[PDB]
Amino acid sequence: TLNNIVSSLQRNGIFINSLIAALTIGGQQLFSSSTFSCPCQVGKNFYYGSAFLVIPALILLVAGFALRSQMWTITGEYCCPLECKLACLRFFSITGRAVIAPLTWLAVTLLTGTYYECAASEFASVDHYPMFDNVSASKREEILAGFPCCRSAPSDVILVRDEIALLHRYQSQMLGWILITLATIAALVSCCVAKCCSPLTSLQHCYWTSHLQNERELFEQAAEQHSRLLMMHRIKKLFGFIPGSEDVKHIRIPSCQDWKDISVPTL
Amino acid sequence: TLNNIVSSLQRNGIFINSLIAALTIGGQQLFSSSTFSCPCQVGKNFYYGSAFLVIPALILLVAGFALRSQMWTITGEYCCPLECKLACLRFFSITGRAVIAPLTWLAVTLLTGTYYECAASEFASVDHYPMFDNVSASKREEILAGFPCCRSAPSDVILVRDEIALLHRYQSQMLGWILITLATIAALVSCCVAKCCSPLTSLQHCYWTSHLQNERELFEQAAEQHSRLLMMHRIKKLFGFIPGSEDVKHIRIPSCQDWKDISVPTL
Amino acid sequence: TLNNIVSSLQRNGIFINSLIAALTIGGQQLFSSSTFSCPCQVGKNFYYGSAFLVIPALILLVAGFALRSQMWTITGEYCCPLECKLACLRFFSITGRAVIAPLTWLAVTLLTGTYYECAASEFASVDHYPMFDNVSASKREEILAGFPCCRSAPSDVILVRDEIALLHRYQSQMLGWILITLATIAALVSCCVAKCCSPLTSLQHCYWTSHLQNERELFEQAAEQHSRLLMMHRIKKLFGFIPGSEDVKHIRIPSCQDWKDISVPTL
Amino acid sequence: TLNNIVSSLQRNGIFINSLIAALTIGGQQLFSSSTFSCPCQVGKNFYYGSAFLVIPALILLVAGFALRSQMWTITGEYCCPLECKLACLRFFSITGRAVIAPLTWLAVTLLTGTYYECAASEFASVDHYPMFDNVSASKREEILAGFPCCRSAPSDVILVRDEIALLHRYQSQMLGWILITLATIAALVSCCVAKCCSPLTSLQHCYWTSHLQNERELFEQAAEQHSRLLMMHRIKKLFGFIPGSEDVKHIRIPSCQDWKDISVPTL
Amino acid sequence: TLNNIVSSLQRNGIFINSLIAALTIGGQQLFSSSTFSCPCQVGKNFYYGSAFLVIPALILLVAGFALRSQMWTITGEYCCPLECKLACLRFFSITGRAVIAPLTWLAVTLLTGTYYECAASEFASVDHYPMFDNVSASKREEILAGFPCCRSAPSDVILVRDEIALLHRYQSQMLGWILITLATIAALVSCCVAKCCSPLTSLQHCYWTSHLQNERELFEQAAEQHSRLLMMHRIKKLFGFIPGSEDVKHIRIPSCQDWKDISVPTL
């Protein structure tokens, strides 16, 4: 009964996607909490924030594609009629499974806002501030590059610092919501177009998916068993008894040519 | 006996709806407690409050529609007599299941009132207040935009601040109740009209719903088994034995054309 | 033996009603403790108290009616001799089950008294108080509207405040008892009239109720099984084997017209 | 063996009565501890104490009568020889079960004495007290109405207050004992008269009570089963198979008139 | 059922790789936390940081290759047509398993950044610093070599120290991301080329891998059993009974030449 509910969960797309999203959230939380500190330099703040913001998204997307064995088969079909559309639909389902990780990472990282502040702490528009008039441009880049990591300046500076930080957090969370909404809308219209383009009815589709899963599992079982039987026959020929046999009555001593023979697997 | 009560709960619309509502409430509580802070800017306070207030409602509604497989089938029927009314009724039941999430999120978020204060902290009507007479309009937008996040001004300011906050909380909770009542009334009249328009009697309807559930489960079971049998026959033809067979007496070595053959699934 | 006592409790009207009442009490306690604060405005105090006092009662009553499936059947009978009286009696039992929630909520909320103080904190009769003579009417509405939420005024004000609060709590609890007594008396006379009007004897009534419960459960079981058998025959016709069969000897490959055929359920 | 001792307790009148009394005591304790505060007004103190003292007694008595199904049957007999006396005896046993709740509530509430002090804190006889000579009658009602809730006056006032409180507690507990004794004596003489008037011997009575319990349970079992059999026959006629049957060989498709037919239950 | 899921995990490449990565991370954390301290010398800081950075990577890579028994067989094939490509593919899978450890160690050690600071604390570009103008070159190497381990100098020195440390941490984490991205991209293009060059189809490949695993396990089982049977026959010849036999009736005392005989195993 345990394996019953195990497979029943395995089929559930919702459970697998929720697990992927929860794992991404937790991993991102730990990762940010431990290994994130702003450089607080002048030219290198941007790249530092954008790397954490973007790179793991690409990594996780490429992982979500490459870790699906079915993707390799469909690529082999493409790599050097109806079948084209069916391949497109399988690749579509693969994309649906894979895309959940980069977008959840991006959404949680933007909603938290910590990365964005560091990423765009130099682009702050400072035109109506009383302390920044006299300061030289280079000195301006220096004072502007210090705000996110820490505060050591007088109270007026920490005031303007907190105001800029609040503005940038707002911008970050707004980007997060724009991305969430755009992604859900795109996924909806994409499922709509996929259903519209499908040459199958609503019943043939279920038979199709079941056929795919059963076909893969059955061919792997059969191939493994047939190979084992052939190997067991090669060994019975060489030694003179079947490996599983009990109380074998005839044993054949191998010669010096038989070893040479069984060296090669005949593919 | 466990799966007995599991399916018995699965049928219960009341239990599923209560679970959806409890999960939405808890998720909203955590979400608000962790990632909510007002920008306390001048033009950007509104959008920030309205995003949290509205966007997750749209997200959850689109989710409640799209996650129901039956909706995809009915759309396929619509996508390029009595059947039209039956499709309308199924889509109606789907809507009934889906609508519970956005309205519970909206009701709990309005009753709590925290989002509304930030959302409409600029529109405060300040005409009979003694400190706001002399202040310039821009300075007025600046002092008005600071009240929700924190208080650093003298005691008179914190007094007027607390009064405005109480007024806005009142308005929020009133909107919450208006929405709850309007939604329940609309749901009631909608179920009434649906029952009135139904061409079925009170008994044919039960037979209908049972037929729908049984039809879907049975066709998926049958299709999966038939596909497995056909695949098991293709493998018996290629290898020479049935994958489940024990003590197979005849094994056929595949040729170089058979692999080419079994490459294609014949759809 | 577990399901034995489970159904035995399910039949018990007393247990179900006690559970409904306990759940309403607990929910009201939590709800009031968390999301209740007085606006302490001038015109908006009343509506705020009356909403919490009244709206959930209407909500819970409409819920207690609409969540009973039998009510839908009786409405369908009414919706576009002896049977009329029997329908009246069933609807009466439904009302008996449903009414327990709004009245328990109202009784507990009035006995607690917290809502009533806020609801009617403006209507206080202030004619024999020494501080309210000179105060202007608008200023009077302002001082009167502040008493429930908090006290910041001198000791004389907190004295008169506590006195008004005690008077209003008294009025609230008295209303609570009047409502409890009126409701119990009405329920008693209503059960009396229902028994008096019943055209059945004391024995035919038991047979009647048992007939109703058995009729509903049996027709749902039978209809579900018959639909499953018909579906299993349609699938045997299409595929060539019965879904439950083991070691099927004849498999029929479907054609391109059979899929079209089984697309429609024949209702 | 569990249901054995469960029914054995169910028969025990002593256990059921002890449970009712313990539940009433605990409920009264919680109720008084949470929702009881004196108004400390002038004209409204009395009604406030008398409501808590009396109303729940009436409520619980009407509940103890109305919750007994047998009472409904006997009323139906009365509602529009030996049988009259037997009905009187059944109604007598019902009264014996019902009366335990109001009298236990009254006894515990009077023995505690908290309600009585508030109920009769205005009627105090103040004729030999040195501070009450000069005070005007209205001022006297004001000072007299403040004693129970709290003490803020000088030490002489708190002295006379504590003395009045002790006197009223004494009166309350004395009333409690008078009520307990009167109730037990009345119950004793009432059981005596009931035994004296009973036209049955000491053995016919046991057979009678057993007959009543067995008659009710048996008729409900039989009626339910007979109704189920008749319903199962109506369904066999409509569908063509009995709902419990396994491997049904003949299935009859219903026509459009059969649904109309089975719509009505034939009562 | 335990060994079922044990082997099912054993097959999972993802689980084994995740376990290797987690173990490497934990071991690196402990190792760095306990046995890492900078020498804070002048010429020897570099080698000290580069050893920890690089050497364990080489060690773990050579371990990941050498601990795979299959690698020894393929090397024996190489050591003094289609088979060459198949050997290349097996060696490729071995590389895929092995490479996960050195790159995870390098990535975690660079992302942490502690090693890099010590490794390149001498190469700091000091051209625009006010305290380093006058200092002699040798004294410069001395002050520059002290920053990572500890701070004892005045506040200006600890300021410039913290700035250099932040710059070097930035450079380290950037190198970490460059390495992660380059490694994932190389692995992707490498799997692509391997799939492109594979002379097998998508089905022959599964049969191939299953054949390899079954062939190895079966030949080891068979060889062990055959050797045991031959040994049991040599012992039956020498002693006169089979080691497992019960109630042996004939025992042969060995002579002084038989011991000489059984001394040699005949290979």
Added chain:
Amino acid sequence: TLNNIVSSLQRNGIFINSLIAALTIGGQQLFSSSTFSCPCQVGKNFYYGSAFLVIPALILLVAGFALRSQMWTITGEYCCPLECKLACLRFFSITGRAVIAPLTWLAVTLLTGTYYECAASEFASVDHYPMFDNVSASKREEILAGFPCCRSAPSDVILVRDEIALLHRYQSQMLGWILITLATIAALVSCCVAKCCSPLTSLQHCYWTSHLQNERELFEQAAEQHSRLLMMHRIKKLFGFIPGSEDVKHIRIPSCQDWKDISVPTL
């Protein structure tokens, strides 16, 4: 099933080696923590550090060789063609098992560095230090010999002390890494040469190892049983019954010569 996984672990070389390494690490940690203190003499510091560093390595190596029973058999073969190479390979496997302990002890003791500081605290190169110019050579050996155990001198001395200690820890850990790398490289090239020199194929080798293990276990079982049977026959001859027999009917009293006879075991 327990003994199943017990033997399966017993075969695992990796598990046994990991256990040996963990035990060596823990034992070394305890040993160093409890019984290690520097003498802080002048001529005797070196020997004291080198003993702990080196002696347990020799001890553990000789133990790893001598505790393997197979080593005794191969030595007996050597002690006063193909067989020589096979003996070399067995001795090689023994060495592979044995070498893991001394090198792990050496690596952990060097990486920790505590022993090395004491071992080479006299050889410190003191040529560019301001306090050591004037001090006489003997006094120099005295001040130099005190640094590791404790510090009682002024702050300048503890400064130079900490610097020397850091330098020596660096040298120790560098030696540790050099030893680890040299050992792994030597083990790799040694396994390579052993595989290259092996006159067996990749399959004959598995049969060989299995033959060795089975041969040893079987001959010990057979020899023990045969000896027991012969002894049981000597006792049956002397006493007149077989030791395991039940309900022996004939008992023979031994004479005074039989005891003399059974005194000798006939070897």
Added chain:
Amino acid sequence: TLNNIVSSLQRNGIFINSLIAALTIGGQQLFSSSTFSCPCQVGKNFYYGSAFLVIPALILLVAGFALRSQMWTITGEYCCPLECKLACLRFFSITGRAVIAPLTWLAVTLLTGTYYECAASEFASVDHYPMFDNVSASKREEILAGFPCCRSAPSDVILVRDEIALLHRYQSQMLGWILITLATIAALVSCCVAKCCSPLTSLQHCYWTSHLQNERELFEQAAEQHSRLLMMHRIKKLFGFIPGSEDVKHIRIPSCQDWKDISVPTL
């Protein structure tokens, strides 16, 4: 299965030796911690340290020899060809088991060093110390005899005391290592010579040891059973029934001579 692994451990020489060593270590630790205090006399310090150092070693060695029953048999053989060498080998194995205790006790006691300091605290070479020049020889023995137990003298004395204590601890631990190395080397060369001198091959030896163990256990079982049978026959003769018999039909009353007879056991 429990006795299976119990005997399997019993055979393991390594487990028994490890247990002996652990028990000796723990016992020595407790013994030293509780009952060890230096006399701090002049002539009696030496004997006190040497007793604890040496005597328990002799005790434990004599115990390890005398507690082995096989040693008694071999001594009986010696006490008033090939057999001499076989006896030598058995006595050798006994020595191997016995020697582990005295050497572990000596090694742990020397490595700890506490005993040695007390044992040789008088022999300290005091020739280059400034306080010991003037002191008279007897006074020198008095000051020298006080250092180990406690310190009450000025700081210069505690300095020279700690230095002497460190020197003596060094000497102790060096002796410990010399003893460990000498013992392991002697054991190795001794096992080598024993294997070299053994007239048996590598297989006859296993048969020999198994024969010895089986011979001892079997003769004890047989002798016990035969004696029990003879005793049971003497009792059957005297009483007239066999002690284990059930429902004995014939009972013989003993006479006054039979008691005299059964008094003697006939040896």
